[PDB]
Design a protein around this nucleic acid. Structure first.
Ligand SMILES: [Mg+2]
Ligand SMILES: [Mg+2]
Ligand SMILES: [Mg+2]
Ligand SMILES: [Mg+2]
Ligand SMILES: [Mg+2]
Ligand SMILES: [Mg+2]
Ligand SMILES: [Mg+2]
Ligand SMILES: [Mg+2]
Ligand SMILES: [Mg+2]
Ligand SMILES: [Mg+2]
Ligand SMILES: [Mg+2]
Ligand SMILES: [Mg+2]
Ligand SMILES: [Mg+2]
Ligand SMILES: [Mg+2]
Ligand SMILES: [Mg+2]
Ligand SMILES: [Mg+2]
Ligand SMILES: [Mg+2]
Ligand SMILES: [Mg+2]
Ligand SMILES: [Mg+2]
Ligand SMILES: [Mg+2]
Ligand SMILES: [Mg+2]
Ligand SMILES: [Mg+2]
Ligand SMILES: [Mg+2]
Ligand SMILES: [Mg+2]
Ligand SMILES: [Mg+2]
Ligand SMILES: [Mg+2]
Ligand SMILES: [Mg+2]
Ligand SMILES: [Mg+2]
Ligand SMILES: [Mg+2]
Ligand SMILES: [Mg+2]
Ligand SMILES: [Mg+2]
Ligand SMILES: [Mg+2]
Ligand SMILES: [Mg+2]
Ligand SMILES: [Mg+2]
Ligand SMILES: [Mg+2]
Ligand SMILES: [Mg+2]
Ligand SMILES: [Mg+2]
Ligand SMILES: [Mg+2]
Ligand SMILES: [Mg+2]
Ligand SMILES: [Mg+2]
Ligand SMILES: [Mg+2]
Ligand SMILES: [Mg+2]
Ligand SMILES: [Mg+2]
Ligand SMILES: [Mg+2]
Ligand SMILES: [Mg+2]
Ligand SMILES: [Mg+2]
Ligand SMILES: [Mg+2]
Ligand SMILES: [Mg+2]
Ligand SMILES: [Mg+2]
Ligand SMILES: [Mg+2]
Ligand SMILES: [Mg+2]
Ligand SMILES: [Mg+2]
Ligand SMILES: [Mg+2]
Ligand SMILES: [Mg+2]
Ligand SMILES: [Mg+2]
Ligand SMILES: [Mg+2]
Ligand SMILES: [Zn+2]
Lengths: 234, 208, 150, 138
RNA sequence: UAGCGCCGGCCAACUCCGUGCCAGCAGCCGCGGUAAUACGGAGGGCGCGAGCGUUACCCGGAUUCACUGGGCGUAAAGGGCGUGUAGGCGGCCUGGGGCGUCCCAUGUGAAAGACCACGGCUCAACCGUGGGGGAGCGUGGGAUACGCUCAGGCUAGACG
RNA sequence: CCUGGUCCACCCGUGACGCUGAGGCGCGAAAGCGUGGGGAGCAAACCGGAUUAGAUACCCGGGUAGUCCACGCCCUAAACGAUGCGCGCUAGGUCUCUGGGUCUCCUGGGGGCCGAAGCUAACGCGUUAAGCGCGCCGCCUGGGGAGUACGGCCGCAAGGC
C-alpha cells in the first residue's frame, strides 16, 4: 500500500482535447498529450484508498466496471481476486438502476446451470434443446461477474468514467459512491474518489487496480502476496 | 323567514346528525338513524367523487344549517369574524355561539334551537332583567340569560328546566335550575365546542 | 402515515393506422402533513394502474418542507417552464390561500397558513412541478447560518 | 466604458459563482470595495483583497460555496443564491428608513448607500437612516 | 304570506315522458337530424328567501399597457442602412457646495367617512363619544455614501 | 488615377474628449417614371404554333417597353441572421481568412461548425448568445374588416409614409 515513483506508467495521456475540469490534475503538455501531475495522483490515492479500506474492512460490496476492451481482463481478475463482482464485457442499462429486473437474468443463469447437469438435459428436439443452449452461453458472458451482486454495491470502481459513463450515472443517481481511475478526458466532478492517472495502458490500469485489491485484502486482514494478472500485462 | 320545513332531511343531505329537534333526534328515529342516505329519488345511488367546491359548500351548509341562521346573517357574522383579531375560524364559531337563541339552547331553557328561537321572539326570555326578543341578539360575557317570571309557570318551561336537573352544562356557561337563570361566562373556546364541522373549510368556501 | 391526493387525470391520445390509442396520465401528491411532500406523475393503459404508478413515483420524489408555526420560512417565486409560482409566508388563521394544485401539495406538506399566486402558464402539471421546486428551495435561518458561517 | 460599475461587479460575482470559480477580479473603486466589506462580513464571500492586474487596481473577490452534494449534479449550493442590482442609472431608487425593505423575512439583506455610509438593511434601520437602495442579496 | 333562479361542463343539484337539425336553448364551450341528465313538462334535487332573476355599467380575475409586474429568431413585435440634433445615460482619485437623497423638530393635513374602543335605541342597520394612523407641502436644524454641480488630478474608455 | 473603411505592432501623444440617438440630413436591390442616347442577347405586353374539356398558362417560334449609359426622380422588398447599437462578464474543440510573435505554438481581428454553464414552448441559441448584466432608440398588445377609408406630408405619375 504505497509507492510514489510509479511513473512506471500513468500520467501523460490522451491528446489535447481534454476536459478543462480535469485541468486541476494536470502538470503540463509535452509533445501533445497532457501529463497528469503525479504528486496529486498520490494525494488522491491516499484519500481514495482510505475510503476503500474503511468500506472494505466493513464487509462492503464493491462492483468493478471496466469494459474498455483495453483493460478488459485486468478487471475481472482483481475483481475475482476478491469477493467483489464485476462487469467485464458490456454494461447494460439498469444494472444498478433497473437492478431488481436485470437480476432476473442471474436468477435465470444459475437457473440453467441446473438443467445443464440433470436428467432433463436430453429433452425436446434440438428445437427447444438448442434455444436453451445459447440461452446460457451469453448470460455466462455478461453476468459472469454481475453474478455475485445480490444488492446494490456499496460503491463502484470504474476504470474510465467517460467510457463507462452510463454506469457512473447510475451510481450517482442511486447515491452509490463512485470510485474511478480517470484522466484528462473526463469530468472529475462526477468521481467521488478520483484516481487521476493513465486511464489506458494496461500497465497503469494494472498497477492501480491491482494495489486497490491489495489494500482491500490487507484491510480484510487475509493478507496475500502478488497478483496473477501481471501475465496478461503482456 | 328561517327555513321552516322538512328538517331531518337536511340531516340526511349533510349525512350527519344535526340536532334541529332536540328530543327524537336521540330516539331511534332521527332518520339519520336508519335511512342515512340523502333525500330525494336519488339518495341511494352510488355517490360521485365530490368537487373540492362541493365539499366546502356542503361543509358551510352543515355549520350554518345547525344554528338555523340565514345565509345573509351567517355571511355577515363570518365577515365580522374575519375583520376581527384572532384566528377567524375560532372567532366565527364563538360569535355564532353568542346568539341569544343559541345560548337559550345551551342553557336548556329549550329543547332545540328553533324552539329556543320562538321562546325569544315570544318574550319568554330575559337578559340582565329586561326582556329581549331578538334571536340574533349577541350575548356579552357576564350577562344573565333567564326566563321571565310571567313565563316560569308554563308547562314547556317546566318540562324543560326540569329535565335539566342534574344535567350538566357547557363550561363557558352556568345554570341555576331553580332560579331558571344562567350566565354566559366566557366566549366558548374552540376546544369547548365539539361541532361536526371542520371550519377551516368554511373559511375556504368564502375565500374563493 | 402518508396521505395521497390526486391532482388530476388526463386521457391523452396517440395515432395508428386504424385510429386513436389512449393512455392515462395521473398527477398524485403524497405527504405526512408533517413536513414531507412528494409529487408523482405516472401514466398507464388504464387509470388505476396509472394512479398507483403515480403514487409509487411520488414516494420516490420527497421534499423536506421546513414548516414554521404552520407557514414557510420566507417567500420564494419559482419558474418552471412557463409556469411561475409565488409562495408568500402568512400568519395563523390565514389558511392556505392557493389554487387547487399548489394547495393539495402545500396541505399534504404540513403547510397551514400561506399566501400563494399562480402566474404565467397555469398548466397544472408545470405549476405542480414549479411548486415542489419552490418548497425544495426554502431555506432556514439555521441553513443560511450554516452556509455563511465559514 | 462601464455603464453601471456596481452592476458590473454584482454581475461579475454572479457569473463567476455559477461556474464555481475560486476568485474573480473586478476593477477597483472605493464604493465597490465598501460593498465587498459587507459581502464579507455578512459572510457571502470568503473575503477579498486588492490586487494589481496588468498594472491596474482590481479587487480579488474570493467566493464561497456550500459542500459537494449527493446524487447527480454534486455541485455545491450557492452561498449567494441571489444578488440583484436595484437602483440603477436611469432609475435611481431611494427609501426612507420606514421604507427600507426586508429581504426574505430577514434571511437575506439589502445593501443601501446612506450619508452615514454603506449599510445593510439591519444597520441602516439601526442608525435610523435610509438612502439609495443599492442592491438585494440573499 | 312564499316565492324566484338553477340541476351537460365551468357550477351545488337527475330521472320519466314529449319532441325529432323541428320546436327550441345558449355566458363561453356547445345541445336538438327517434335512448337528449343541455329543448317543453313532470317527479325529484341544489341555491337563496320578501325576495329571486334579468339587462346595463364600474373594479376584479387580466403580470391581457406589466411602476409593483410583460415582451419582440420562427407566436403580434427591430426601424432597409448610416450620419447625426435635442434628450437620456456616464471610467478612477481628491476637495468645495449640499440641488436630488436621508434624518430630527415644528406648522399644515376642517367636519363627515374609513379603522379601534366604549356607549344610546330591547338587537342591528343608524347614531354618540373618545383614540390612532396619514402621503404631500411650508419652516428651522443636521448628514454627505450615492446622484448632481464646481475645482483639481489620473489613464484602464475614447481619440490621435 | 482619385477616395472610404479597417486590422496588427510600438507602446509614443491628448486626457473621459464617452454610449445611444425623437426629429433632421444622406444612402438605399428590382421594377417603375422624365429628357436624351443606346439596343448584341434576353424578354412583361403582344402576334402566332402546340397541349387541353377549355389553356386569356405551363412547351415552341417571334416580339415592344424594359434590361445598358447619362442626368433627374421614385424608396419599396422574404431591404433576412425574419435576431437594433455599445460595453463588461461567463468551459472548451475543430476548420478557415488576415496580422504580430521566441512559429510542431502563443497572441489579435474576421468567417463557420460542435459544444460547458446557462437560456428556450420547443426547434434551437451557446465568447459571432437567443447566456449573465447596465445604458439609449425602435417596435408588439387576439383574427377578419385593412395596410383599407379619411386627413396630412411627399411624388410628374405609379404610388410612398
Ligand atoms: Mg379574523
Ligand atoms: Mg385538453
Ligand atoms: Mg418565461
Ligand atoms: Mg391549481
Ligand atoms: Mg396566459
Ligand atoms: Mg423597484
Ligand atoms: Mg355538479
Ligand atoms: Mg342533450
Ligand atoms: Mg327522448
Ligand atoms: Mg343547462
Ligand atoms: Mg329539461
Ligand atoms: Mg331581510
Ligand atoms: Mg372586468
Ligand atoms: Mg391590471
Ligand atoms: Mg384586452
Ligand atoms: Mg415593467
Ligand atoms: Mg406577453
Ligand atoms: Mg409567418
Ligand atoms: Mg412575426
Ligand atoms: Mg436589421
Ligand atoms: Mg420588418
Ligand atoms: Mg449628445
Ligand atoms: Mg459618475
Ligand atoms: Mg463633497
Ligand atoms: Mg463632490
Ligand atoms: Mg439639500
Ligand atoms: Mg408632517
Ligand atoms: Mg378628517
Ligand atoms: Mg348597545
Ligand atoms: Mg367620530
Ligand atoms: Mg429644511
Ligand atoms: Mg460636508
Ligand atoms: Mg476631471
Ligand atoms: Mg504613452
Ligand atoms: Mg499628462
Ligand atoms: Mg450614432
Ligand atoms: Mg433605388
Ligand atoms: Mg432599374
Ligand atoms: Mg427610362
Ligand atoms: Mg429612351
Ligand atoms: Mg426570344
Ligand atoms: Mg401560347
Ligand atoms: Mg416565349
Ligand atoms: Mg436603434
Ligand atoms: Mg472557434
Ligand atoms: Mg506568423
Ligand atoms: Mg474567432
Ligand atoms: Mg480565429
Ligand atoms: Mg443544458
Ligand atoms: Mg432573458
Ligand atoms: Mg423536445
Ligand atoms: Mg451550438
Ligand atoms: Mg380588430
Ligand atoms: Mg375586434
Ligand atoms: Mg402598399
Ligand atoms: Mg401633392
Ligand atoms: Zn334529526
Amino acid at each position: 500500500v504505497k509507492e510514489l515513483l510509479e511513473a512506471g506508467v500513468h500520467f501523460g495521456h490522451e491528446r489535447k482535447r481534454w476536459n478543462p475540469k480535469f485541468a486541476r490534475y494536470i502538470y503540463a503538455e509535452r509533445n501533445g498529450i497532457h501529463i497528469i501531475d503525479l504528486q496529486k495522483t498520490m494525494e488522491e490515492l491516499e484519500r481514495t484508498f482510505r475510503f476503500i479500506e474503511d468500506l472494505a474492512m466493513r464487509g462492503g460490496t464493491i462492483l468493478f466496471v471496466g469494459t474498455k476492451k483495453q483493460a478488459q481482463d485486468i478487471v475481472r481478475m482483481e475483481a475475482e481476486r476478491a469477493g467483489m463482482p464485476y462487469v467485464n464485457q458490456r454494461w447494460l442499462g439498469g444494472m444498478l438502476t433497473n437492478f431488481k429486473t436485470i437480476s432476473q437474468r442471474v436468477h435465470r443463469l444459475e437457473e440453467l446451470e441446473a438443467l445443464f447437469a440433470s436428467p432433463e438435459i436430453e429433452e425436446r428436439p434440438k428445437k427447444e434443446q438448442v434455444r436453451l443452449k445459447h440461452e446460457l452461453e451469453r448470460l455466462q458472458k455478461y453476468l459472469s461477474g454481475f453474478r455475485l451482486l445480490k444488492r446494490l454495491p456499496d460503491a463502484i470502481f470504474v476504470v474510465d468514467p467517460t467510457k463507462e459513463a452510463i454506469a457512473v450515472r447510475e451510481a450517482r443517481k442511486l447515491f452509490i459512491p463512485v470510485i474511478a481511475l480517470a484522466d484528462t478526458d473526463s469530468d472529475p466532478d462526477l468521481v467521488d474518489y478520483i484516481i487521476p492517472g493513465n486511464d489506458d495502458a494496461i500497465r497503469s490500469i494494472q498497477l492501480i487496480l491491482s494495489r486497490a485489491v491489495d489494500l482491500i485484502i490487507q484491510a480484510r486482514g487475509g493478507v496475500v502476496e502478488p497478483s496473477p494478472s501481471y501475465a496478461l500485462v503482456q | 323567514g328561517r327555513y321552516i320545513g322538512p328538517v331531518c332531511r337536511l340531516c340526511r343531505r349533510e349525512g350527519v346528525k344535526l340536532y334541529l329537534k332536540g328530543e327524537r333526534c336521540y330516539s331511534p328515529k332521527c332518520a339519520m338513524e336508519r335511512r342515512p342516505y340523502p333525500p330525494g329519488q336519488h339518495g341511494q345511488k352510488r355517490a360521485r367523487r365530490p368537487s373540492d367546491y362541493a365539499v366546502r359548500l356542503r361543509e358551510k351548509q352543515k355549520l350554518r344549517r345547525i344554528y338555523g341562521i340565514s345565509e345573509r346573517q351567517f355571511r355577515n357574522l363570518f365577515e365580522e369574524a374575519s375583520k376581527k383579531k384572532g384566528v377567524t375560524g375560532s372567532v366565527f364559531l364563538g360569535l355564532l355561539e353568542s346568539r341569544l337563541d343559541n345560548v337559550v339552547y345551551r342553557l336548556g331553557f329549550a329543547v332545540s334551537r328553533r324552539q329556543a328561537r320562538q321562546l325569544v321572539r315570544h318574550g319568554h326570555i330575559t337578559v340582565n332583567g329586561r326582556r329581549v326578543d331578538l334571536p340574533s341578539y349577541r350575548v356579552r360575557p357576564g350577562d344573565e340569560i333567564a326566563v321571565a317570571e310571567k313565563s316560569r309557570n308554563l308547562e314547556l318551561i317546566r318540562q324543560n328546566l326540569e329535565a335539566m336537573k342534574g344535567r350538566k352544562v357547557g363550561p363557558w356557561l352556568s345554570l341555576d335550575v331553580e332560579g331558571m337563570k344562567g350566565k354566559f361566562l366566557r366566549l366558548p373556546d374552540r376546544e369547548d365546542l365539539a361541532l361536526p364541522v371542520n371550519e377551516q373549510l368554511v373559511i375556504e368556501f368564502y375565500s374563493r | 402515515d402518508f396521505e395521497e391526493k390526486m391532482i388530476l387525470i388526463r386521457r391523452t391520445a396517440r395515432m395508428q393506422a386504424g385510429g386513436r390509442r389512449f393512455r392515462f396520465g395521473a398527477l398524485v401528491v403524497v405527504g405526512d402533513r408533517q413536513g414531507r411532500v412528494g409529487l408523482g406523475f405516472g401514466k398507464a393503459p388504464e387509470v388505476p394502474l396509472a394512479v398507483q404508478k403515480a403514487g409509487y413515483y411520488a414516494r420516490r420524489n420527497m421534499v423536506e418542507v421546513p414548516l414554521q408555526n404552520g407557514t414557510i420560512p420566507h417567500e420564494i417565486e419559482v419558474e418552471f417552464g412557463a409556469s411561475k409560482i409565488v409562495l408568500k409566508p402568512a400568519a395563523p388563521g390565514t389558511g392556505v390561500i392557493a389554487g387547487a394544485v399548489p394547495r393539495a401539495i402545500l396541505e399534504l406538506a404540513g403547510v397551514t397558513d400561506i399566501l400563494t399566486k399562480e402566474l404565467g402558464s397555469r398548466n397544472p402539471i408545470n405549476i405542480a412541478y414549479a411548486t415542489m421546486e419552490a418548497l425544495r428551495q426554502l431555506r432556514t435561518k439555521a441553513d443560511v447560518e450554516r452556509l455563511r458561517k465559514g | 466604458m462601464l455603464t453601471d460599475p456596481i452592476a458590473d461587479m454584482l454581475t461579475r460575482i454572479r457569473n463567476a459563482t455559477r461556474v464555481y470559480k475560486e476568485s474573480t477580479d473586478v476593477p477597483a473603486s472605493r464604493f465597490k470595495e465598501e460593498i465587498l466589506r459587507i459581502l464579507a462580513r455578512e459572510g457571502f464571500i470568503k473575503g477579498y483583497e486588492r490586487v494589481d492586474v496588468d498594472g491596474k487596481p482590481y479587487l480579488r473577490v474570493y467566493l464561497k460555496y456550500g459542500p459537494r452534494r449527493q446524487g447527480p449534479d454534486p455541485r455545491p449550493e450557492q452561498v449567494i443564491h441571489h444578488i440583484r442590482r436595484i437602483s440603477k442609472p436611469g432609475r435611481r431608487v431611494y427609501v426612507g428608513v420606514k421604507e427600507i425593505p426586508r429581504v426574505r423575512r430577514g434571511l437575506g439583506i439589502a445593501i443601501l448607500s446612506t450619508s452615514k455610509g454603506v449599510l445593510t438593511d439591519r444597520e441602516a434601520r439601526k442608525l435610523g437612516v435610509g438612502g439609495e437602495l443599492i442592491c438585494e442579496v440573499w
